[PDB]
Tab-separated table of C-alpha atoms in Angstrom:
chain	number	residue	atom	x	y	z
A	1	UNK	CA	155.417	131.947	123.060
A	2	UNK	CA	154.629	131.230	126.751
A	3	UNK	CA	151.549	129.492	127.728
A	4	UNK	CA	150.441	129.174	131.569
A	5	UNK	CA	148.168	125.929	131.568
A	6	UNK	CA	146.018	126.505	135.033
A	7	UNK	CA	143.882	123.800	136.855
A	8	UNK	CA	141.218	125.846	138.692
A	9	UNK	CA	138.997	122.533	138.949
A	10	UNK	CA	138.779	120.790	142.108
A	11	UNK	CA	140.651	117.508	140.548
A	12	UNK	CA	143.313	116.593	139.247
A	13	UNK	CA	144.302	116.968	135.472
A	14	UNK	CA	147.084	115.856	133.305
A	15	UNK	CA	147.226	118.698	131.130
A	16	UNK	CA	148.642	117.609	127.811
A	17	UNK	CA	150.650	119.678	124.594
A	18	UNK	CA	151.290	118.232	121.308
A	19	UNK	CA	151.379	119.433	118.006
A	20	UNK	CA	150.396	115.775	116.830
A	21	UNK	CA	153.967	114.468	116.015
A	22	UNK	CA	155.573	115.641	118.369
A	23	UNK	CA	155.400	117.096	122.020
A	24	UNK	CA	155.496	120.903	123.060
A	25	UNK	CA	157.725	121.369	125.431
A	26	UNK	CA	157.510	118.692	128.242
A	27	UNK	CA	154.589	117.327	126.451
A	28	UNK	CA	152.267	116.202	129.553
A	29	UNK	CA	152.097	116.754	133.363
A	30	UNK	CA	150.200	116.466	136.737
A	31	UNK	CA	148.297	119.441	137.391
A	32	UNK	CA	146.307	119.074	140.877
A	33	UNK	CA	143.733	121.614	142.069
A	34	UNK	CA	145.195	125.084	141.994
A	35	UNK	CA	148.219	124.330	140.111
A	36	UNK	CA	149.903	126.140	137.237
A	37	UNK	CA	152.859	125.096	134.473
A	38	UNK	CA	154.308	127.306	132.343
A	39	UNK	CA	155.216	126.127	128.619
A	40	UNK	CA	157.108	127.434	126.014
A	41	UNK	CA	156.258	126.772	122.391
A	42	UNK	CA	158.000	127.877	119.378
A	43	UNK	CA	157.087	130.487	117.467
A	44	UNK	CA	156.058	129.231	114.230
A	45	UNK	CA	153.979	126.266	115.351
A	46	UNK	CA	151.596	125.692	113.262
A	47	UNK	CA	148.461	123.154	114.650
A	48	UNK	CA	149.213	122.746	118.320
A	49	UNK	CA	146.581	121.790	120.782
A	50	UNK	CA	146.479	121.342	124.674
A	51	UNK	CA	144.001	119.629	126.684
A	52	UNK	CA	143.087	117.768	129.915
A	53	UNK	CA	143.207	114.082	130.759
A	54	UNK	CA	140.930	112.474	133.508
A	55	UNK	CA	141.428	109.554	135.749
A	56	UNK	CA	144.794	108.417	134.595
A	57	UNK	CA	147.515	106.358	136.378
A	58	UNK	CA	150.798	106.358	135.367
A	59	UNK	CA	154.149	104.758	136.921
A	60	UNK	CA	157.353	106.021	137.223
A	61	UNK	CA	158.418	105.297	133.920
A	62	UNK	CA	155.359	108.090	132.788
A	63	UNK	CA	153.205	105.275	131.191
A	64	UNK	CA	149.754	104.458	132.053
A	65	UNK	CA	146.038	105.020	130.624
A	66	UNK	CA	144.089	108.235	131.286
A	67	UNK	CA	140.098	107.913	131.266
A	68	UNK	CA	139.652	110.247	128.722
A	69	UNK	CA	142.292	112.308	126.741
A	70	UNK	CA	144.842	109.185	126.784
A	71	UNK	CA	147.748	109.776	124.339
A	72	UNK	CA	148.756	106.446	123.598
A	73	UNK	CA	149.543	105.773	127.427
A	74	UNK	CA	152.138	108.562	127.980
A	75	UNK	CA	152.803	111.185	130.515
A	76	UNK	CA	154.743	113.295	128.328
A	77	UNK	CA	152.403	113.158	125.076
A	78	UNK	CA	153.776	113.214	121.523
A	79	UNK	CA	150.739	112.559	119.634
A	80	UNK	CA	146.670	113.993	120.066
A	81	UNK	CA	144.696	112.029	122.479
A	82	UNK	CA	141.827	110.321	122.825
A	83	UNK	CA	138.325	111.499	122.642
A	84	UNK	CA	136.417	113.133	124.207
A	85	UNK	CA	138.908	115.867	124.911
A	86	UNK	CA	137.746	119.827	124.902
A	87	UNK	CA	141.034	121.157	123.068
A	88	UNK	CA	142.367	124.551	122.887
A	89	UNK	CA	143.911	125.165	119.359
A	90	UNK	CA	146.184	127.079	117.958
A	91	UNK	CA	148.729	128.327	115.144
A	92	UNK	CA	151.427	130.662	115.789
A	93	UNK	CA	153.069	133.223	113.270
A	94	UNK	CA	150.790	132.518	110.351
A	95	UNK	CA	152.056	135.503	107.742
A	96	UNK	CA	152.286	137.892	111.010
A	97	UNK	CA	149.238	136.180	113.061
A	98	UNK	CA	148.207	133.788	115.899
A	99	UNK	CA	144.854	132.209	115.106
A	100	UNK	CA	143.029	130.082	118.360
A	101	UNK	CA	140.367	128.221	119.096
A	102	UNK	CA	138.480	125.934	121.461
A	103	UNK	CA	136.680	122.729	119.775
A	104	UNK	CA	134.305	120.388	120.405
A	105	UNK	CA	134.793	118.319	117.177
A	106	UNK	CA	136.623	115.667	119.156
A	107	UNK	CA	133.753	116.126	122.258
A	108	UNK	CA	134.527	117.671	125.622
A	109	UNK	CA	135.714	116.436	128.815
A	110	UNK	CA	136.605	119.403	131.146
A	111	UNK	CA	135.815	123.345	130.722
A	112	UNK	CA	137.728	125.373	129.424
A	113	UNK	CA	139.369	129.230	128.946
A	114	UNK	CA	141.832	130.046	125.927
A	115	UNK	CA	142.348	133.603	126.433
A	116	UNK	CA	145.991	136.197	125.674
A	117	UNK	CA	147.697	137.067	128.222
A	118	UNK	CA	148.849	139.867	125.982
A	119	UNK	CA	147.418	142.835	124.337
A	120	UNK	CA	144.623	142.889	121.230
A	121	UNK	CA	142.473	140.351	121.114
A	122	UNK	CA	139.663	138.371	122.661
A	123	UNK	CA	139.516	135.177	124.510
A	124	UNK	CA	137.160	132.213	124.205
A	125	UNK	CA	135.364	129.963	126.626
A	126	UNK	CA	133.751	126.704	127.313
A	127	UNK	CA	132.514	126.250	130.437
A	128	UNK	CA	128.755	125.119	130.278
A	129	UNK	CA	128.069	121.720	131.940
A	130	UNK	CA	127.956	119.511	128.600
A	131	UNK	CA	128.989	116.571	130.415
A	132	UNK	CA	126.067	116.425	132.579
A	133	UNK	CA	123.205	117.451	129.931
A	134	UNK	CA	125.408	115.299	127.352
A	135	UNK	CA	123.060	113.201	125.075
A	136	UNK	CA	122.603	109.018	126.661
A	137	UNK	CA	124.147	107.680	122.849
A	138	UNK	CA	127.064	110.498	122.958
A	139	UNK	CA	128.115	109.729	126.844
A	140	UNK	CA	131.343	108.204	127.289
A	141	UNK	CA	131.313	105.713	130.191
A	142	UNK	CA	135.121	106.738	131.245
A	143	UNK	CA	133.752	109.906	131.360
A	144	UNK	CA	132.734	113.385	129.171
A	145	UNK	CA	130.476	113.719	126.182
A	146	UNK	CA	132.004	111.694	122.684
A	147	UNK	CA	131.284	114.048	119.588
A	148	UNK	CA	129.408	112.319	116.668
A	149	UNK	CA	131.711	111.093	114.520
A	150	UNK	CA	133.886	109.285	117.155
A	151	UNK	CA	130.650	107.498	118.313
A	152	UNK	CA	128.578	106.949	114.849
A	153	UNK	CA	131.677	106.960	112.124
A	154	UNK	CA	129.770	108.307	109.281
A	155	UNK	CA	130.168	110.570	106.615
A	156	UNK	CA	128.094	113.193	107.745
A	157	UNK	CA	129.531	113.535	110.936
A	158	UNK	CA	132.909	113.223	110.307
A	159	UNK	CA	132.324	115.270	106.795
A	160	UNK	CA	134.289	112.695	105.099
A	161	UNK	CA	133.697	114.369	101.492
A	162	UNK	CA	133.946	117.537	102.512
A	163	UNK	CA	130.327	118.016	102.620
A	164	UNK	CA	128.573	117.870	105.785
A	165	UNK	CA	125.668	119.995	107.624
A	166	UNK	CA	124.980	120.842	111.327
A	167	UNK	CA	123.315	117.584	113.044
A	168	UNK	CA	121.156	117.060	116.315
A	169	UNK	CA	124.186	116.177	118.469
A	170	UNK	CA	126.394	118.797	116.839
A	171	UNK	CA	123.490	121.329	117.484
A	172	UNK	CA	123.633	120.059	121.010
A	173	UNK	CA	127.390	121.512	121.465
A	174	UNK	CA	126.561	124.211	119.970
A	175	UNK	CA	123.404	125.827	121.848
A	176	UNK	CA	125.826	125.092	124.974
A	177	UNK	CA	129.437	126.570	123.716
A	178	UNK	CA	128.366	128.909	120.635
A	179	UNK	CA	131.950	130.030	120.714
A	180	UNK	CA	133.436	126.536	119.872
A	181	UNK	CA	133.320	124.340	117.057
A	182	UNK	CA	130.565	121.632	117.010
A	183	UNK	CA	131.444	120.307	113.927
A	184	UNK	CA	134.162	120.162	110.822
A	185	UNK	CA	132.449	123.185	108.974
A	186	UNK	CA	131.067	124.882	111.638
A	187	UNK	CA	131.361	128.924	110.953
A	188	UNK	CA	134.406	129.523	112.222
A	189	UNK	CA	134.883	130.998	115.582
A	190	UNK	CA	138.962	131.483	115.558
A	191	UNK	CA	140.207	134.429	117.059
A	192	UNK	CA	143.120	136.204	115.230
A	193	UNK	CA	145.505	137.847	117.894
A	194	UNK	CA	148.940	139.580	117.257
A	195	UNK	CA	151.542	137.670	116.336
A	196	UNK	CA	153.796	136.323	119.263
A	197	UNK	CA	151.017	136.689	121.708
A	198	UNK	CA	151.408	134.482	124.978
A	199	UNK	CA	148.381	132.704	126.311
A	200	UNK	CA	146.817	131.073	129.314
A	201	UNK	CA	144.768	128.051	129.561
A	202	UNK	CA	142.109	127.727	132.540
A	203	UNK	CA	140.895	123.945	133.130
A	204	UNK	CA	137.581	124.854	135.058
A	205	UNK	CA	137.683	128.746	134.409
A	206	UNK	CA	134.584	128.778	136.266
């Protein structure tokens, strides 16, 4: 499956693709205003995500420290990153199915678009300004909006036992991106698209 990753904000991003032990194709790169990279991910891939990193340096070995989304240091990410990180999610050829996803569980950073490039199904969006009407306790001081349970590290926001509710600050992500998850048993908003769909993610969309 091909994904275009597309940085239509007016900074740079190092978009980022793992699948959380391992990288998806190149794993990481520089994207700066405008700019668009084309990745291929193999069918079959089954919890992949992709986000954007903020403020990073990096030498020419590719390691370095992003602001927020930092994956252990790397350029080329092999593992999930730091939050707060909006992530686009996704599993690929699931008995004949793609399911996606944006989330919020791990907080947000930059907007975001998820949507097919292909025929017969929907896209999903978060683009409201969460960062600036983020709550004072959930603001990260690198940067973006920290969900809940990264901040507070209980059970009811990380719904440890499996048993959890909506909360203020989930509620919070929520009234902003209804179309995202706010929290670990949030009603679901995947999307189920055709199998072997190809994809574009827009950093910014709006």
């Amino acid at each position: 499956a091909t994904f275009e990753i597309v940085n239509r904000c007016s900074y740079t991003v190092w978009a980022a693709a793992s699948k959380g032990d391992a990288a998806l194709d190149a794993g990481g790169r520089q994207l700066n205003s405008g700019e668009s990279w084309t990745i291929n991910v193999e069918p079959g891939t089954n919890g992949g995500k992709i986000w954007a990193r903020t403020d990073c340096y990096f030498d020419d070995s590719g390691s370095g420290i992003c602001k927020t989304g930092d994956c252990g240091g790397l350029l080329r990410c092999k593992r999930f990153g730091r939050p707060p990180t909006t992530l686009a999610e996704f599993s690929l050829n699931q008995y004949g199915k793609d399911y996606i996803d944006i989330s919020n569980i791990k907080g947000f950073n930059v907007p975001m678009d998820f949507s097919p490039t292909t025929r017969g199904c929907r896209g999903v969006r978060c683009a409201a300004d969460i960062v600036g009407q983020c709550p004072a306790k959930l603001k990260a001081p690198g940067g973006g909006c920290n969900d809940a349970c990264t901040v507070f590290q209980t059970s009811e926001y990380c719904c440890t036992t499996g048993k959890c509710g909506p909360t203020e600050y989930s509620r919070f992500f929520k009234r902003l991106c209804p179309d995202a998850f706010s929290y670990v048993l949030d009603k679901p908003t995947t999307v189920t698209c055709p199998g072997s769909s190809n994809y574009r993610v827009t950093f910014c969309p709006t």
